[PDB]
Design a protein around this ligand. Structure first.
Ligand SMILES: C/C=C(/C)C(=O)O[C@H]1C(C)=C2[C@H]([C@@H]1OC(=O)CCCCCCC)[C@@](C)(OC(C)=O)C[C@H](OC(=O)CCC)[C@@]1(O)[C@H]2OC(=O)[C@@]1(C)O
Ligand SMILES: Nc1ncnc2c1ncn2[C@@H]1O[C@H](COP(=O)(O)OP(=O)(O)O)[C@H]2O[C@@]3(O[C@H]21)C([N+](=O)[O-])=CC([N+](=O)[O-])=CC3[N+](=O)[O-]
Ligand SMILES: [Mg+2]
Ligand code: NA
Length: 994
């Protein structure tokens, strides 16, 4: 029964056909259980280790590699010779990388936690019901509770399901539902029906929400819903139905993979069409078997050369280091991939309280009526000093500190603030300061009462923990608080009923003290207090009051105003139904206006600047707040979201105004709005969807369980460090300090990380292009392998990996926050850079093939068979070229390959330097601009000499230490690549403008 809040208790018992005194019968249970199912959120889909291991070999490139591993294994099974010590090595290394790769994937998916499974923290194991099969309350498993069940809850209990309250056994029922409605204070519950079938949870005063806690009292009620039908269960289904998309980089990397396997297969088809002449060779004889192996051999090398095997580890490592760095800046990233998205943020939706403001409330102004004489009226306005909850401060008039007690009006003002209050003050020793004990707004009143000191008391004779309630305790001992009519959104006021203490047995003397939003309170006032006297509320006097409230709430003071009144002749105690909130406004009528207090929840010191950075970075900032609209706008103007005088009528909306707009207009409304006042949790989700329909990359803050859906929906959900664990687990980022500024700072950081990632992604992929050219060249020229998989793999995982990582540390561009958000669809490589990397690739393909062909021919230590063309053959059966001799296994000599590899390594070290900047000459941006890079290059070269000399290695890699002459030919061939790019960069800098 999802509409229970609006039905009578009798109608709910009737609907389910249950007896309040007995509970459900065993047949009702079986039938209800079968109909509504068990009371629990569905269990997560179990994912077996095998399934988790298989999903690892799901990527297109890992498959290509696995295929390469097979060919490499079978090819190593029928190898010619006996170099088994350095044979099965190749297929093993490939297979091992796939294993490590899988281990990492499985590892991460283990220590990962989902927000849904976290919701289960709010469902208790046990519950207490009343069933016909017994007379005493029996505690069963929450899981077995069902709709219709008469249930019992008491202080300390965790609500087991959504329940309609039947009867409150205690004097009052208090519930802590902070996690669902964001109501910090525990709230009071009643049993009367709430007429609105669409009432938001805060208005459902007769319901207990599954997952919340009873703060005080004992109550009996009937279960309305269970499982996914509860409020928390509905949040659970929303989250489950939320499909998140891959980040822009993941998408680009996925399109890269698809196209890469398309190129690989194409290059294989090519090597075939360039050797179609073999179909003309004589059938008998020939190297049929030795030719097939040759083709499959370049296929493996081709796949290994195309795939940037070390790029993922470089990405992860750069994200981790950046992540640890952001932490220091108070931004805790939970999802590494989110960093890029954060850099692309175009819209930041931010709750105001505690994020844009400090959540430190203090009264700054206050006024009372001075006098009324016909059309003439005068007020007595004051100011108060001190922005802390601390009783440190003083009242003043015309900037002169006065004695509050010297004004009768102020004495009553303080009385009301003192009594009509559910909060207090406490001196936290751990911090040495003060902490609000209750609502921020009420505590401000408490503090005010202390600073005012209407009854000149000796507070300086007490400590920091005693005078924390000095002047307050004084007011209490005067008036006895009988009962309090809690605050309600519809009347926007609250009040306490008080009887004098000095008058034990008095038939009169009772007063109701009222506090609330100005408009409603002032309209219910028939009298205005002037000092101790009283006069009727008149038009001239009301306008005067409203006049000043408007200036304080809508003006540059940006203050939340509260009207304070007194019911001089309150109804007789017995004639009041303290259980039907619907009549509270009635009891708070015929009031006497006492005064108005204006308090400020000050903007963070750093938000003013951060709002500017966002405007300079082309990022929109939307403020979400509980303030009334007029004060919401005034606050926006104050922090810079709106101009001090710009029209913003169609850029600021209340939840109500927005629901009144048809769907078409709500969408448009979100494209230009920067202020949303008084919205329900559902609004955040819709705002996101509408922003996503404009392709915005949205960042959205939240803290309660009710924010989870939206936090999950937003590309960057941002949770409060001081918020719920559920909100955290549903967010990409957590602000350890709750500061809006930490957001802006995290976005810049995201911008600076992406630019560097781009440089090392282009650097690694560029090298792969070159590697392939070398393999394709050595396939069209019929030359012996210049590079083999085991060598390429080392270069792609180690040699190039260090430099790639170093580029991650490239200094950021000074104007990072001076350009609009990057477009998600922006490709990493195209146009002139595409041409550049092709040119560099062709260059790299020749520099490597040449170095090896240079050793086989024009060399001082190798076969002086110049122009001999190894193309002719590798069969060695006709000896057409050589007229006399016995030697052909030199074609497998490690010397030529060591030249090829040293060229690649060296060229790549030079190409790392060319990657410091996309278009800046090494003259403008020298290499030493990044010491990490220089240092990395030295490390890579020393590792190159490691596999050349440390015996076990040179054999494993088929390498052979080079001669100073062979080395000088390396540097001769390599170094020039720096000049090649410099020229290409020069062309991009001058002859390519727009
Ligand atoms: C990686 C290795 C190789 C050999 C390859 O061909 O990659 C292509 C490829 C898959 C792309 C291409 C490569 O294309 C070429 O090199 C042109 C043909 C040369 C024939 C060589 C014959 C021996 C990238 C590498 O070329 C250059 C020259 O830079 C640029 C870019 O890549 C990126 O933007 C990286 C984004 C992850 C992609 O066109 C990309 O495909 C896409 O969808 C993109 C958008 O990804
Ligand atoms: N949808 C809505 N309809 C009507 N009012 C809404 C409202 N949403 C918020 N408010 C009022 O505004 C204040 C701020 O509300 P809040 O929901 O906490 O927003 P933030 O999270 O943005 O800070 C609350 O203070 C109070 O009523 C509340 C409040 N309270 O919530 O208990 C108590 C008292 N009081 O003591 O009389 C005064 C308040 N006030 O604004 O003046
Ligand atoms: Mg809040
Ligand atoms: Na999200």
């Amino acid at each position: 029964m999802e509409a229970a809040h609006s039905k009578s208790t009798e109608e709910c018992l009737a609907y389910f056909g249950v007896s309040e005194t007995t509970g459900l019968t065993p047949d009702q249970v079986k039938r209800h259980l079968e109909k509504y199912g068990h009371n629990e959120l569905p269990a997560e889909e179990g994912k077996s280790l095998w399934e988790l291991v298989i999903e690892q070999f799901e990527d297109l490139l890992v498959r290509i590699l696995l295929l390469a591993a097979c060919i490499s294994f079978v090819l190593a099974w029928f190898e010619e010779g006996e170099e088994t010590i350095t044979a099965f090595v190749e297929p093993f290394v490939i297979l091992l990388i796939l294993i490590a790769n899988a281990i990492v994937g499985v590892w991460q998916e283990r220590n990962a936690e989902n927000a849904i499974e976290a919701l289960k923290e709010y469902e208790p194991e046990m519950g207490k019901v009343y069933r016909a099969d017994r007379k005493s309350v029996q505690r069963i498993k929450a899981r077995d509770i069902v709709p219709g069940d008469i249930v019992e809850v008491a202080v300390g209990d965790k609500v087991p399901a959504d329940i309609r309250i039947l009867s409150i056994k205690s004097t009052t029922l208090r519930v802590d539902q902070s996690i669902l409605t964001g109501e910090s204070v525990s709230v009071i519950k009643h049993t009367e029906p709430v007429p609105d079938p669409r009432a938001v949870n805060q208005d459902k005063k007769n319901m207990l929400f599954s997952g919340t806690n009873i703060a005080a009292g004992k109550a009996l009620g009937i279960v309305a819903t269970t499982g996914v039908s509860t409020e928390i269960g509905k949040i659970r289904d929303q989250m489950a139905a939320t499909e998140q998309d891959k980040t822009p980089l993941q998408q680009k990397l996925d399109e890269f993979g698809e196209q890469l396997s398309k190129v690989i297969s194409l290059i294989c088809v090519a090597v075939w069409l360039i050797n179609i002449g073999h179909f003309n060779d004589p059938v008998h004889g020939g190297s049929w078997i030795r030719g097939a192996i040759y083709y499959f051999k370049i296929a493996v090398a081709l796949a290994v050369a195309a795939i940037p095997e070390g790029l993922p580890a470089v990405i992860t490592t750069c994200l981790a280091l950046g992540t640890r760095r952001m932490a220091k800046k108070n931004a805790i990233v939970r999802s590494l991939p989110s960093v890029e998205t954060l850099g692309c943020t175009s819209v930041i939706c931010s709750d105001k309280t505690g994020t844009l403001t400090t959540n430190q409330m203090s009264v700054c102004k206050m006024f009372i009526i001075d006098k009324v004489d016909g059309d003439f009226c005068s007020l007595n306005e004051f100011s108060i000093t001190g922005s802390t909850y601390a009783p440190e401060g003083e009242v003043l008039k015309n900037d002169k500190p006065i004695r509050s007690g010297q004004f009768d009006g102020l004495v009553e003002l303080a009385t009301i603030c003192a009594l009509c209050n559910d909060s207090s003050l406490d001196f936290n020793e751990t911090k040495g300061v003060y902490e609000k004990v209750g609502e921020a707004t009420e505590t401000a009143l408490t503090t005010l009462v202390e600073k005012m000191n209407v009854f000149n008391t000796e507070v300086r004779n007490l400590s920091k923990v005693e005078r924390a309630n000095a002047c307050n305790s004084v007011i209490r001992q005067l008036m006895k608080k009988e009962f309090t009519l809690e605050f309600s959104r519809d009347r926007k006021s609250m009040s306490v009923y008080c009887s004098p203490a000095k008058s034990s047995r008095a038939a009169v003397g009772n007063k109701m003290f009222v506090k609330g939003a100005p408009e409603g309170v002032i309209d219910r006032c028939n009298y205005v207090r002037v000092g101790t006297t009283r006069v009727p509320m008149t038009g001239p006097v009301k306008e005067k009051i409203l006049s000043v409230i408007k200036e304080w709430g809508t003006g540059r003071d940006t203050l939340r105003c509260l009207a304070l009144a007194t019911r001089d002749t309150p109804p007789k105690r017995e004639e009041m139904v303290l259980d039907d909130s619907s009549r509270f406004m009635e009891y708070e009528t015929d009031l006497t206006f006492v005064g108005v207090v204006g308090m400020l929840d000050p903007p963070r010191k750093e938000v003013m600047g951060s709002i500017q950075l966002c405007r300079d970075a082309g990022i929109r900032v939307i403020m979400i707040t509980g303030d009334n609209k007029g004060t919401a706008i005034a606050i926006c103007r104050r922090i810079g979201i709106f101009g001090e005088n710009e029209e913003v009528a169609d850029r600021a909306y209340t939840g109500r105004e927005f629901d009144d707009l048809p769907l078409a207009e709500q969408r448009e409304a979100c494209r230009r709005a920067c202020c949303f006042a008084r919205v329900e949790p559902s609004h955040k989700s819709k705002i996101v969807e509408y922003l996503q329909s404009y392709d915005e990359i949205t960042a959205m803050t939240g803290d309660g369980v009710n924010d989870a859906p939206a936090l999950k929906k937003a590309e960057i959900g941002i949770a409060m460090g001081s918020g719920t664990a559920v909100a955290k687990t549903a967010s990409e980022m957590v602000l350890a300090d709750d500061n809006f500024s930490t957001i802006v700072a995290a976005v810049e950081e995201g911008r600076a990380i992406y630019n560097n990632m781009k440089q090392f992604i282009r650097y690694l992929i560029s090298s792969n292009v070159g590697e392939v050219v070398c393999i394709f060249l050595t396939a069209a020229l019929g030359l012996p392998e210049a590079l083999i998989p085991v060598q390429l793999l080392w270069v792609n995982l180690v040699t190039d990996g260090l430099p790639a990582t170093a580029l991650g540390f490239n200094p950021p561009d000074l104007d990072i926050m001076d350009r609009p958000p990057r477009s998600p669809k922006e490709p990493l490589i195209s146009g002139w850079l595409f041409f550049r990397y092709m040119a560099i690739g062709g260059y790299v393909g020749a520099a490597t093939v040449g170095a090896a062909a240079w050793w086989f021919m024009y060399a001082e230590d190798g076969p002086g068979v110049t122009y001999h063309q190894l193309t002719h053959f590798m069969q060695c059966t006709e000896d057409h070229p050589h007229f006399e001799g016995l030697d052909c296994e030199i074609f497998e000599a490690p010397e030529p390959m060591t030249m090829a590899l040293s060229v690649l390594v060296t060229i790549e070290m030079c190409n790392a330097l060319n990657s410091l900047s996309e278009n800046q000459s090494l003259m403008r941006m020298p290499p030493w601009v990044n010491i990490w890079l220089l240092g990395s290059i030295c490390l890579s070269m020393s590792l190159h000499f490691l596999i050349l000399y440390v015996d076990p290695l040179p054999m494993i890699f088929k390498l052979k230490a080079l001669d100073l002459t062979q080395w000088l030919m390396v540097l001769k061939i390599s170094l020039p690549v720096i000049g090649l790019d410099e020229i290409l960069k020069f062309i991009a800098r001058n002859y390519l403008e727009g």
